[PDB]
Amino acid sequence: MIGSEKQVNWAKSIIEKEVEAWEAIGVDVREVAAFLRSISDARVIIDNRNLIHFQSSGISYSLESSPLNSPIFLRRFSACSVGFEEIPTALQRIRSVYTAKLLED
């Protein structure tokens, strides 16, 4: 990850917290975890840390309000990540299985 040691440390801590929030859903979120960990530029993570944050009110609202649903928002990661093109559909799948999970419970 490019950046100063401070920037890289901040950004990696942001990214690991985010991956943990996604993995607390209880469904396959491996495509999202992979994309988040692919981001190459600490400054891009830091500048977007509040927008990408997967909040704690409730999972449904976190899924619906995530800017990872938007190909337009994700343009900003086109030069410093892998798999951004497919991330909106990944969220579609996650929102499906989550819905199904709530139905199956």
Side-chain angles (χ1 to χ4, degrees):
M1 176 179 303
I2 84 156
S4 66
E5 190 96 345
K6 190 176 126 73
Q7 286 174 328
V8 162
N9 273 344
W10 193 4
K12 290 173 164 167
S13 75
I14 284 161
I15 283 289
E16 280 314 304
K17 174 165 262 53
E18 288 312 313
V19 168
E20 180 202 51
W22 282 90
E23 292 183 336
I25 304 174
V27 302
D28 179 8
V29 290
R30 285 144 60 208
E31 203 167 356
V32 171
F35 159 74
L36 285 169
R37 285 175 169 143
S38 78
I39 305 174
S40 325
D41 194 325
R43 179 193 289 151
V44 175
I45 303 177
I46 287 156
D47 290 345
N48 291 283
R49 63 189 192 279
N50 295 326
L51 278 158
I52 62 171
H53 176 53
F54 188 90
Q55 327 92 298
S56 300
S57 180
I59 290 160
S60 302
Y61 171 59
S62 291
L63 291 170
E64 156 176 55
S65 63
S66 173
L68 276 52
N69 288 297
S70 166
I72 296 150
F73 172 89
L74 284 172
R75 297 169 63 103
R76 77 200 50 209
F77 299 101
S78 64
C80 60
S81 83
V82 166
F84 49 95
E85 261 209 52
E86 296 76 38
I87 281 300
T89 311
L91 260 69
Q92 297 296 157
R93 283 199 187 78
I94 280 143
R95 289 159 74 178
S96 290
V97 290
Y98 183 58
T99 295
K101 184 199 168 110
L102 301 177
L103 258 64
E104 264 143 30
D105 303 352

